[PDB]
Amino acid sequence: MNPPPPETSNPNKPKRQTNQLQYLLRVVLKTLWKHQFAWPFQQPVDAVKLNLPDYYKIIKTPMDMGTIKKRLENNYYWNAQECIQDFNTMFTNCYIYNKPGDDIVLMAEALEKLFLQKINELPTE
Ligand X SMILES: CN1C(=O)c2cccc3c2C1=Cc1cccnc1N3Cc1cccc(C(N)=O)c1
Binder of ligand X out of 8, 88, 92, 98 (CB under 6 A)? 98
Give yes or no for residue 68 binding ligand X (CB under 6 A). Answer: no
Query: Are 108 and 35 spatial neighbours (Cβ–Cβ below 8 Å)?
Result: no
Q: Can you tell me the distance from the alpha carbon of 77 to that of 92, in angstroms, rounded to the nearest whole number?
A: 20
Q: What angle do CA 54, 109, 122 make, to 5 degrees?
A: 120
Binning the chain into helix, strand and coil, the percentages to the nearest 5 are 55, 0, 45
Give yes or no for residue 54 binding ligand X (CB under 6 A). Answer: no
Shortest distance in whole angstroms from residue 107 CB to ligand X: 6
Query: Are 125 and 19 spatial neighbours (Cβ–Cβ below 8 Å)?
Result: yes
Query: Are 108 and 95 spatial neighbours (Cβ–Cβ below 8 Å)?
Result: yes
Shortest distance in whole angstroms from residue 121 CB to ligand X: 28
**Which stretch, 19-27, 81-89, 92-100, 116-124, contacts ligand X (CB under 6 A)?**
92-100
Give yes or no for residue 92 binding ligand X (CB under 6 A). Answer: no
Binder of ligand X out of 26, 103, 117, 123 (CB under 6 A)? 103
Give yes or no for residue 94 binding ligand X (CB under 6 A). Answer: yes
Residues that bind ligand X (CB under 6 A): 40-41, 45, 50, 94, 97-98, 103-104
